[PDB]
Ligand binder design. Structure first.
Ligand SMILES: Nc1nc2c(ncn2[C@@H]2O[C@H](COP(=O)(O)OP(=O)(O)O)[C@@H](O)[C@H]2O)c(=O)[nH]1
Ligand SMILES: [Mg+2]
Ligand SMILES: [Mg+2]
Ligand SMILES: [Mg+2]
Ligand SMILES: [Mg+2]
Ligand SMILES: [Mg+2]
Ligand SMILES: [Mg+2]
Ligand SMILES: [Mg+2]
Ligand SMILES: [Mg+2]
Ligand SMILES: [Mg+2]
Ligand SMILES: [Mg+2]
Lengths: 67, 25, 213, 135, 62
RNA sequence: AUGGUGAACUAUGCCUGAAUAGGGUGAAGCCAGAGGAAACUCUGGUGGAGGCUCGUAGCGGUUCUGACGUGCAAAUCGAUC
RNA sequence: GUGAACAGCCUCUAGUUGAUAGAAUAAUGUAGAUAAGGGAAGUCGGCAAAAUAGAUCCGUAACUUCGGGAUAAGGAUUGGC
RNA sequence: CUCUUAAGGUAGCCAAUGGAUUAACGAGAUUCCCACUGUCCCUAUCUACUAUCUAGCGAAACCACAGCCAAGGGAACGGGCUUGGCAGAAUCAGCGGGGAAAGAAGACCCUGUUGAGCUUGACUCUAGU
RNA sequence: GCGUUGGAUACCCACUAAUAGGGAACGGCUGGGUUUAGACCGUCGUGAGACAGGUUAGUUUUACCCUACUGAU
């Protein structure tokens, strides 16, 4: 749903190839590590979803085409 | 309804619309 | 209804001024023969801070014209007055900052302070820090002087009323934010018991007419 | 399953039954996604005398042309007003107020009119009401 | 003073006047605002019904 | 209702006295070095500000299916704060 | 003495050894602890307990009024001779 | 007489910023995660002081009379009334089902008075002006 | 005669032989509720205040008596 440029501008990260890599890179950059070095996948995902819903990430659905 | 002048509305200056936070440049 | 604080303050009690650390009442000299006819010279010995007053005060020593002794007066310091300066007070005093002159002896546009409302009451107008009185004009036939007060009002007073040349020192005091209830506390500790203030709406209808809801 | 409880839907039917004007609040980012088409069909079938309009909120989160296109497309069905809800820095408040005054003047036989705000959760109904009241 | 009394106000602007009618309320305003406290039944010392509650009359109509 | 008594508790103003370990952070002013035409920037020190902060004495009184309930006590005890 | 320390613990000087006692060790309590495997499945609700903790070093995000956040987070170490 | 759907290809013009989606702080209210555990499955064991027995000392609440049940007795509802079950001294530790047994005993509705240093163009007034 | 569960938030998931209905209340601990004094938002009222309402914080502490019951002389 979101543009790559918008996501990378919002979260100051890049270089991911899938959602798991995106979550891992964001967790390691933000310091969301569990006890033992494991990234906090669920917590980072919940924060991403909250930001998406509350409008800290730009996105929209395209309107119908003009006639 | 009257005139809806959308040119008087300022959109929110979100962090994802700023070119200063470019990655890979 | 219960007596409000506004009505309570009239009985005195805990609402009197805190005057232990004051230097003395700030007044001009008594209007005497020397100031009515010629002039008299005093010397600024010190400039001191007065508790509860923004403006500093100046101790000025004169010689007693009728007895061998010295007389100490407490003037409100105008800006630019220094220790060791000679001050001249009287009808024949020169137009210099710090001198005390009758209002009829100064030209239009003169800036004065600690101005007598009536001739001999020893200073009533423009006493707070940074304030002054402007000499608008003269009416010689009625022996009157038109002046402009700090509030913007225009007044007519006697030309024999006296005033000190210059502007009261310590100006610009209220341009600094206090930032702190503590600084307000220490400000009013040296003045009187009028702080802090409780809003009438926050009270009960018995305590204040604004109460209730 | 939140938003589909009997108590919530009883409240919805109560506000519709008490309302003369119904404002359906849509999200400018997903207006077709945040539409209650079944509620609109029920209103046009059973209560044709109640006036239903669209308010497209959160227009500050989309580009200007996207909001203009959505307003143009939704106006083909219902009167749609673009909006941005805020107590201090809002958009569309005067237009909504003058439209409500028009409805009040149309229902001049009624001593007062009620405008009920319905829509999806988090679309900003309470924010729009606070914007109208400036409090 | 004599200017703020009820009698003088009536002159400036017999049995038809009702309780509570003042500068702010007329008769219709008074009765509409008394609607909010209207719905109560009245009983005496012995417990007989002086007045039934509003919209709670027990008489069977014909 | 009339006439009297209380600010030894407590509320507030005033006058004259007294009390308050050890840590963390590191403001202005100042020194040296690297840049610069200057203004000014950067690095390392010095200094010891704050109705700052951790935490004793002290002041207060948040919480506990707490103790006690003719209790030690007509408001106390323990831990926690 | 230990220790950053008027902290906690032990000691010298000085001062106490006071509070009805004796004998047994059922249930239920008040106060304090431990527990295989699982780890909130308990309960309205992680209430209560447990876990953490000093010092040294590495390192520390969003946000921000640019002063903070911050001991953020996350890691390594500690005796004696 | 007339009014609203002209805006277009993922961020515009217009005036660093376009903000309350406000940092910091909080014995304020709420949700979730890691760790952690007897909260639980599912309970077991240990210590001190009680409880317990004894010597001495020694109260209080409360008390119409009393104290085993079942059915029936003109709203619910008995220890006493009618008909039955039955029923043997004197007692100890527990226990919390029942007891005008107590302690919770007062809150909650109704009637009649009183107060309000409550409030208002309610009435007579009145200080002040 | 004998059983009729474990969870999630009246309905679902699962296990199970089965997850039947009901009475002794509705003619001891404990959360929602009668929650009095503090506080805020909304509606009405000229106001004191009241409420179409919504949120938060808020001391009641037996048993050694008789019987019943469990054990013991
Ligand atoms: N950017 C933006 N945010 C909005 C707007 N209106 C509401 N919001 C945000 O949406 C959130 C939920 O709004 P709310 O009024 O509670 O939604 P409701 O469920 O319809 O009542 C709030 O935190 C607002 O900050 C808007 O016009 N623009
Ligand atoms: Mg109050
Ligand atoms: Mg005293
Ligand atoms: Mg402090
Ligand atoms: Mg502190
Ligand atoms: Mg275990
Ligand atoms: Mg659970
Ligand atoms: Mg359960
Ligand atoms: Mg933080
Ligand atoms: Mg017997
Ligand atoms: Mg209350």
């Amino acid at each position: 749903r979101c543009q790559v440029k918008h996501l990378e501008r919002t979260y100051e990260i890049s270089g991911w190839k899938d959602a798991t890599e995106f979550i891992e890179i964001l967790a390691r950059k933000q310091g969301r590590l569990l006890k033992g070095g494991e990234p906090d996948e669920s917590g980072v995902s919940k924060q991403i979803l909250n930001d998406f819903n509350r409008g800290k990430i730009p996105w929209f659905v395209l309107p119908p085409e003009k006639e | 309804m009257g005139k809806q002048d959308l040119g008087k509305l300022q959109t929110r200056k979100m962090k994802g619309l700023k070119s200063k936070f470019d990655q890979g440049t | 209804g219960r007596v409000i604080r506004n009505q309570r303050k009239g009985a005195g009690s805990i609402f009197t001024s805190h005057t232990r650390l004051r230097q003395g009442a700030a007044k001009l000299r008594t209007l005497d023969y020397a100031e009515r006819h010629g002039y008299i010279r005093g010397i600024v010995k010190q400039i001191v801070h007065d508790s509860g007053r923004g403006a500093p005060l100046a101790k000025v020593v004169f010689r007693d014209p009728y007895k061998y002794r010295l007389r100490e007066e407490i003037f409100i310091a105008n800006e630019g007055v220094h220790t060791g300066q000679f001050i001249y007070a009287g009808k024949k005093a020169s137009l210099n900052v710090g001198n005390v002159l009758p209002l009829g002896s100064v030209p239009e546009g003169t800036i004065v302070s600690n101005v007598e409302e009536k001739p001999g009451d020893r200073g009533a107008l423009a006493r707070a820090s940074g304030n002054y009185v402007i000499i608008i004009g003269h009416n010689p036939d009625e022996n009157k002087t038109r002046v402009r007060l700090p509030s913007g009002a225009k007044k007519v007073i006697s030309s024999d009323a006296r005033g000190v040349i210059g502007v009261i020192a310590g100006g610009g005091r209220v341009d600094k934010p206090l930032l702190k209830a503590g600084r307000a506390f220490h400000k009013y500790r040296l003045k009187r018991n009028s702080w802090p203030k409780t809003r009438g709406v926050a009270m009960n209808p018995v305590d204040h007419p604004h109460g209730g809801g | 399953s939140k938003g589909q409880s009997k108590r919530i839907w009883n409240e919805l039917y109560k506000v519709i039954d008490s309302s003369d004007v119904v404002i359906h609040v849509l999200d400018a980012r997903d207006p077709l996604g945040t539409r209650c088409k079944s509620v609109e069909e029920y209103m046009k079938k059973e209560t044709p005398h109640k006036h239903l309009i669209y308010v497209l909120n959160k227009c500050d989160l989309v580009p200007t042309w996207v909001a203009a296109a959505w307003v143009k497309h939704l106006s083909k069905e219902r009167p749609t007003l673009a909006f941005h809800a805020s107590i201090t820095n809002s958009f569309g408040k005067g237009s909504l107020i003058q439209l409500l005054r028009q409805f009040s003047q149309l229902h001049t036989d009624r001593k007062q009119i009620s405008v009920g705000f319905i829509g999806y959760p988090n679309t900003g109904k309470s924010s729009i009401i606070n914007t109208l009241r400036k409090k | 003073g004599t200017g703020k009394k009820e009698k003088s106000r009536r002159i400036r602007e017999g049995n038809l006047r009702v309780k509570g009618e003042n500068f702010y309320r007329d008769s219709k305003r008074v009765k509409f605002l008394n609607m909010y406290t209207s719905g109560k039944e009245i009983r005496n010392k012995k417990g007989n019904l002086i007045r039934a509650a509003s919209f709670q009359d027990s008489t069977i109509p014909d």
